[PDB]
Design an enzyme around this catalytic site. Sequence first.
Site, PDB file in Angstrom:
ATOM      1  CB  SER A   1      -6.544  -6.213  13.562  1.00  0.00           C
ATOM      2  OG  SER A   1      -5.890  -6.526  12.345  1.00  0.00           O
TER       3      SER A   1
ATOM      4  CE1 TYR B   1      -7.321   9.419  -3.108  1.00  0.00           C
ATOM      5  CE2 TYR B   1      -5.927   7.955  -4.389  1.00  0.00           C
ATOM      6  CZ  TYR B   1      -6.687   9.103  -4.289  1.00  0.00           C
ATOM      7  OH  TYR B   1      -6.815   9.945  -5.369  1.00  0.00           O
TER       8      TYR B   1
ATOM      9  CE  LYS C   1      -9.641   5.798   7.847  1.00  0.00           C
ATOM     10  NZ  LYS C   1      -8.399   5.597   7.051  1.00  0.00           N
TER      11      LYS C   1
ATOM     12  CD  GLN D   1      -2.750   1.183   2.508  1.00  0.00           C
ATOM     13  OE1 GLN D   1      -2.844   0.166   3.199  1.00  0.00           O
ATOM     14  NE2 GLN D   1      -3.421   2.295   2.778  1.00  0.00           N
TER      15      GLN D   1
ATOM     16  CE1 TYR E   1       0.663 -10.763   7.185  1.00  0.00           C
ATOM     17  CE2 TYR E   1       2.284  -9.532   8.437  1.00  0.00           C
ATOM     18  CZ  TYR E   1       1.140 -10.296   8.390  1.00  0.00           C
ATOM     19  OH  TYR E   1       0.465 -10.599   9.552  1.00  0.00           O
TER      20      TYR E   1
HETATM   21  N1  LIG Z   1      -1.212 -12.805  13.404  1.00  0.00           N
HETATM   22  C1  LIG Z   1      -1.920 -12.500  12.344  1.00  0.00           C
HETATM   23  O1  LIG Z   1      -2.463 -13.341  11.686  1.00  0.00           O
HETATM   24  C2  LIG Z   1      -2.041 -11.075  11.963  1.00  0.00           C
HETATM   25  C3  LIG Z   1      -3.078 -10.659  11.182  1.00  0.00           C
HETATM   26  C4  LIG Z   1      -3.142  -9.330  10.868  1.00  0.00           C
HETATM   27  C5  LIG Z   1      -2.183  -8.462  11.329  1.00  0.00           C
HETATM   28  N2  LIG Z   1      -1.201  -8.892  12.077  1.00  0.00           N
HETATM   29  C6  LIG Z   1      -0.214  -7.959  12.541  1.00  0.00           C
HETATM   30  O2  LIG Z   1      -0.885  -6.947  13.246  1.00  0.00           O
HETATM   31  C7  LIG Z   1      -0.747  -5.691  12.636  1.00  0.00           C
HETATM   32  C8  LIG Z   1      -2.117  -5.061  12.696  1.00  0.00           C
HETATM   33  O3  LIG Z   1      -2.444  -4.405  11.495  1.00  0.00           O
HETATM   34  P1  LIG Z   1      -3.938  -3.974  11.328  1.00  0.00           P
HETATM   35  O4  LIG Z   1      -4.103  -3.670   9.904  1.00  0.00           O
HETATM   36  O5  LIG Z   1      -4.810  -4.965  11.999  1.00  0.00           O
HETATM   37  O6  LIG Z   1      -3.976  -2.616  12.113  1.00  0.00           O
HETATM   38  P2  LIG Z   1      -5.339  -1.943  12.521  1.00  0.00           P
HETATM   39  O7  LIG Z   1      -5.052  -1.058  13.646  1.00  0.00           O
HETATM   40  O8  LIG Z   1      -6.380  -2.965  12.653  1.00  0.00           O
HETATM   41  O9  LIG Z   1      -5.627  -1.032  11.281  1.00  0.00           O
HETATM   42  C9  LIG Z   1      -4.553  -0.412  10.605  1.00  0.00           C
HETATM   43  C10 LIG Z   1      -5.087   0.266   9.362  1.00  0.00           C
HETATM   44  O10 LIG Z   1      -6.139   1.121   9.732  1.00  0.00           O
HETATM   45  C11 LIG Z   1      -6.001   2.398   9.148  1.00  0.00           C
HETATM   46  N3  LIG Z   1      -5.617   3.309  10.220  1.00  0.00           N
HETATM   47  C12 LIG Z   1      -4.625   3.098  11.060  1.00  0.00           C
HETATM   48  N4  LIG Z   1      -4.520   4.102  11.939  1.00  0.00           N
HETATM   49  C13 LIG Z   1      -5.469   4.977  11.658  1.00  0.00           C
HETATM   50  C14 LIG Z   1      -5.904   6.256  12.202  1.00  0.00           C
HETATM   51  N5  LIG Z   1      -5.274   6.796  13.249  1.00  0.00           N
HETATM   52  N6  LIG Z   1      -6.937   6.865  11.631  1.00  0.00           N
HETATM   53  C15 LIG Z   1      -7.566   6.329  10.589  1.00  0.00           C
HETATM   54  N7  LIG Z   1      -7.219   5.168  10.042  1.00  0.00           N
HETATM   55  C16 LIG Z   1      -6.195   4.452  10.526  1.00  0.00           C
HETATM   56  C17 LIG Z   1      -4.897   2.301   8.148  1.00  0.00           C
HETATM   57  O11 LIG Z   1      -5.531   1.902   6.963  1.00  0.00           O
HETATM   58  P3  LIG Z   1      -5.853   2.840   5.753  1.00  0.00           P
HETATM   59  O12 LIG Z   1      -5.086   4.076   5.938  1.00  0.00           O
HETATM   60  O13 LIG Z   1      -5.363   2.043   4.630  1.00  0.00           O
HETATM   61  O14 LIG Z   1      -7.312   2.929   5.850  1.00  0.00           O
HETATM   62  C18 LIG Z   1      -4.087   1.156   8.684  1.00  0.00           C
HETATM   63  O15 LIG Z   1      -3.468   0.422   7.638  1.00  0.00           O
HETATM   64  C19 LIG Z   1      -0.311  -5.987  11.238  1.00  0.00           C
HETATM   65  O16 LIG Z   1       0.545  -4.964  10.753  1.00  0.00           O
HETATM   66  C20 LIG Z   1       0.399  -7.298  11.357  1.00  0.00           C
HETATM   67  O17 LIG Z   1       1.748  -7.096  11.704  1.00  0.00           O
HETATM   68  C21 LIG Z   1      -1.112 -10.165  12.404  1.00  0.00           C
END
Ligand SMILES: NC(=O)c1ccc[n+]([C@@H]2O[C@H](COP(=O)([O-])OP(=O)(O)OC[C@H]3O[C@@H](n4cnc5c(N)ncnc54)[C@H](OP(=O)(O)O)[C@@H]3O)[C@@H](O)[C@H]2O)c1
EC number: 1.1.1.-
Lengths: 114, 326, 326, 326
Positions: free
Chosen positions: B209, B227, B219, B28, B55
């Site tokens: 997450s 985006y 949002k 991304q 990833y």
């Molecule tokens: N063990 C597993 O199977 C597993 C699975 C998933 C993740 N993980 C790990 O956990 C991490 C969690 O990632 P996640 O995607 O779940 O994080 P999240 O907190 O659930 O969401 C992150 C996403 O939300 C949006 N965002 C983040 N902060 C924001 C804010 N302050 N205001 C508005 N939008 C916001 C962004 O997306 P946009 O800007 O694109 O909208 C960002 O990519 C991953 O990076 C990965 O390392 C592990």
Amino acid sequence: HESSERVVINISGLRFETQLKTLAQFPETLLGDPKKRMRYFDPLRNEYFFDRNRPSFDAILYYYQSGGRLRRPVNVPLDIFSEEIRFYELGEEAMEMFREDEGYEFQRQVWLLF
Amino acid sequence: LQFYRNLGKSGLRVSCLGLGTWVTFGGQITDEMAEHLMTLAYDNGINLFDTAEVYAAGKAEVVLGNIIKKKGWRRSSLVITTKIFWGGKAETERGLSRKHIIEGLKASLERLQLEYVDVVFANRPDPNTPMEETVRAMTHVINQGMAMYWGTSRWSSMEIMEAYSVARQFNLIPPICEQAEYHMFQREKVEVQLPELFHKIGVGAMTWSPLACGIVSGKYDSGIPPYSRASLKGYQWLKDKILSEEGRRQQAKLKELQAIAERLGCTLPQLAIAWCLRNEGVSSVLLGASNAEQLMENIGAIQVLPKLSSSIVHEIDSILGNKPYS
Amino acid sequence: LQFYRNLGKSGLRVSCLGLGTWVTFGGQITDEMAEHLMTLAYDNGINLFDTAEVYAAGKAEVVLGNIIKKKGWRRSSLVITTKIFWGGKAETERGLSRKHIIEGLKASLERLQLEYVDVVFANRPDPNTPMEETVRAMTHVINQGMAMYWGTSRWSSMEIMEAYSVARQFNLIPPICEQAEYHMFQREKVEVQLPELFHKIGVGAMTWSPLACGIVSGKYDSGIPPYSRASLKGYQWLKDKILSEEGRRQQAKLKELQAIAERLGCTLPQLAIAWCLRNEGVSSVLLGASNAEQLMENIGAIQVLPKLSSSIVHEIDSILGNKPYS
Amino acid sequence: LQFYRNLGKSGLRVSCLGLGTWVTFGGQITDEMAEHLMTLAYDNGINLFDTAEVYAAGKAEVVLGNIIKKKGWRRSSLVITTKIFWGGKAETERGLSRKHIIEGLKASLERLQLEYVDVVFANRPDPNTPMEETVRAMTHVINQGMAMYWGTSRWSSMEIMEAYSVARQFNLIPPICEQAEYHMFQREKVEVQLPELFHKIGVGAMTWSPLACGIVSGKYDSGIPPYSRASLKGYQWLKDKILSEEGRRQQAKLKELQAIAERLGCTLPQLAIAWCLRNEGVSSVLLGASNAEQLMENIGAIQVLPKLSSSIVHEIDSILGNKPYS
Ligand SMILES: NC(=O)c1ccc[n+]([C@@H]2O[C@H](COP(=O)([O-])OP(=O)(O)OC[C@H]3O[C@@H](n4cnc5c(N)ncnc54)[C@H](OP(=O)(O)O)[C@@H]3O)[C@@H](O)[C@H]2O)c1
Ligand SMILES: NC(=O)c1ccc[n+]([C@@H]2O[C@H](COP(=O)([O-])OP(=O)(O)OC[C@H]3O[C@@H](n4cnc5c(N)ncnc54)[C@H](OP(=O)(O)O)[C@@H]3O)[C@@H](O)[C@H]2O)c1
Ligand SMILES: NC(=O)c1ccc[n+]([C@@H]2O[C@H](COP(=O)([O-])OP(=O)(O)OC[C@H]3O[C@@H](n4cnc5c(N)ncnc54)[C@H](OP(=O)(O)O)[C@@H]3O)[C@@H](O)[C@H]2O)c1
């Protein structure tokens, strides 16, 4: 919770081993309640340790395996085995059966002398 | 209050917040943006950085590996984790067998340009590989110097306990951590299943997450912004759940939770992240960000953590109505 | 009488005197002086040389590493020890976790320019790391060829015994040595706590600071001499205890102990060092010196050791009045 | 139906068909032909490839090693096995001692130009080497990264079980596989002995010679065709058993089995191979081929496997009359 997962119980060096479904049969007891028995868990050996009487636990574990049979062993004193039942918290309904199987104002004042 | 905290009942000290690389790194966001996001997290005390071999088909570990090499940060000052399960199209390139655990971790270390990761995770349980083979393989890579610790991910508490048994059975190394999804709309595991393992065998939780891929940020109460993650290719599944029946129902509950955010002098993402760190069994929360404004905003959830009263915690459990029956 | 002696109940033969590197190497004395001090100790039969990753922020192991490389001494003829606990500002750069034990020892071997140390110590107990993790890590570096033995430092006898239990529990390697402070004004540990472990599990004691950083030498009964340790930057803590209430009280007792030194035809530093080696549980005493005149004087404590009668030992226990209640 | 299947009760996923290298590689067929045969098998989903240090006096592993290096196939996409027992004229170059297991496997990896094999087999039981020495050696090469798993070949079920005991006794790695001969004229082992071990300790069977070196193909009912295996140097033993008393008796029974092949719309080699895979205890069948027409014909046995009814299985057990008494 009734899942065949194995549990090791160590009584002063005497090792006992049973299934978790056997102890989960009586959730009100010590070994049956995960919150009561965790105080005795040893994460280095994956077993529960008890610094108590050894000849008594044969019948304690069999009380779970048989489903309610609480019979004092022929070599365990009566006072010692009865104090073990209260520790493992088998219950009053079970303690009463153990005793049965073991063979066990002005009006009130004038009523005392006579 | 206390920033750094132990990863379970182990000696590895991680920050309560960590920066992940899912979706963002190598996909991304640009590499120049990923470097900027990581430098901000590192300069703010975050030492935990998460990735996986799945990833971006390995490009995430490559991007992460180049930032660490470019900035010249001390390896002793970083806590790098990686997850192993999906490693290619072939049949022997997936699962938790000794073949793929060793081959997959070795390939990740090559892309990461690192000699070892601090923790190696099993990205999901593998019903085809016996538990003894997986524990021996995880112990093997630790004793070979390819990893310091190993943990589980998406495993049930019954499986995590089994790995601990097989470890004690064969004098091997038990797992120390479990990566479980945990946010305001997914609570059954971290709040019920895991806390028993944290007190019994000391397995910590590294939740992922915290904002439901950005849903909790609020949002989406109007639509699917451009985006954003829901507008991305390959994430139609996320766009479906946002505009579904339950999706609009969750957006309605965020409106009430927004009032709690304004009352506490913070945003809604900060409240949701601080809401996760309120448990002693949660060793760290893995953040996600596509721009620097999101990251340093989410880092501010540490301020909201002291302002979390049991009155407020009970207030949020009433708006959600999903308090798991203990 | 007998110069060399086993380090506890192990096969490693150390001299009863060893040369440390705290304060001096890479800080107080020049590298040309450090080489001269070490060549004197080595040419006099001393094989034990002590250091740590915290001394001079790594410069002590560097200076020590260059002397060994320059003089071309046989590695088989040296007993090199190092202590691991403080390794940098970062959170993951301190403690006894598997991460820092491996990273810290590897970094010390790089500065020392050596493939392995003979003993690796835990410089202090780490309440954050579980005992099983530390013992596994210490066993791991031994089996990896980075160390021959491992010991403890500043651990209580209850903790040393626990490491021995966890070792026997998981078929690992127990510790063989304990570095404890021991001089005429600090006696509670080596004379009470440790001797039980020396007879039970055979853990020897490698005592440090036999002259209380130079206090016992009697050079402070007038004031703080220039160029001494108390006049050094970063050692105001030592200058405080010297000029404190107890500090003058200790200097008064040294005047009586001086008469015992003249009666035995020796100095006061020699008497205090020989006083330490009077126990069978003390495997070696680690010396300290800033000039060659101090070192070869302190080496002469071997002459005073036979001249130590139980009448003299009882005579000193009366002047100090700190005989620990057994 | 299901193509890939686990090698016993382990996590290593092999295809139900594998390509061997006995006789053919480095001996009967050219290297250009061997490359063509292997590329066909690999492009058709076969990941299991078998060899030994005794085949062609090491030239088979060399030919196999050059194909893998030339085609550039991912090592993670291959399952390479090798067998160790015969390694030279010298006395210490044969058997299952720790000396030859380590030396023989290391020499095979050099010829194969590979860092490790997925499975290392004991080509035959060694009555001169104690079981503890062989199990320790097999565990040693696995822990050293020279192999992923180890199995047995031509061992009786009593010996395979003993290796499993000695492994559990000394906390070592048990064997996961057994290579046993299995075709329509050799059935006593795989159908009686092994299935008890597959359910008890989960040892799978990787059967070899499904066509009795080509006898079952029915190409011998007239005589010894030129360029066939029976006409080859060093295989007079095979020509003897073909033209012997039992040899003509087996050719007569193939005439009846041919009718079953035409009724099922397939050949006789396909029926015999599919007949082997009808057991759950058979993890894979090792094929053999000297031309591409034979190989892709034998690969077609997967089509015949669903068409195998218990009526047909009972029909074949009547023509052979060698149903092993369970
Ligand atoms: N063990 C597993 O199977 C597993 C699975 C998933 C993740 N993980 C790990 O956990 C991490 C969690 O990632 P996640 O995607 O779940 O994080 P999240 O907190 O659930 O969401 C992150 C996403 O939300 C949006 N965002 C983040 N902060 C924001 C804010 N302050 N205001 C508005 N939008 C916001 C962004 O997306 P946009 O800007 O694109 O909208 C960002 O990519 C991953 O990076 C990965 O390392 C592990
Ligand atoms: N395990 C631990 O935590 C720990 C802690 C401390 C030390 N150690 C080890 O133990 C060793 C002990 O060092 P230490 O400083 O405690 O040694 P010490 O014997 O207590 O005192 C040594 C210092 O006293 C002065 N001195 C030495 N000999 C003298 C003499 N003959 N006459 C007059 N003054 C003399 C010198 O200081 P000035 O010339 O500067 O006055 C010298 O630096 C260290 O090198 C270190 O390796 C370990
Ligand atoms: N563990 C052990 O001790 C052991 C022992 C032997 C083998 N093995 C392994 O098992 C594998 C089995 O080899 P195998 O020789 O026993 O295979 P096989 O199936 O018994 O016979 C293969 C041979 O039969 C002929 N043939 C093959 N397919 C044919 C077809 N469709 N039509 C007509 N003829 C055909 C070919 O010989 P011609 O064209 O030359 O006639 C070919 O070389 C070996 O490669 C080896 O890896 C292991």
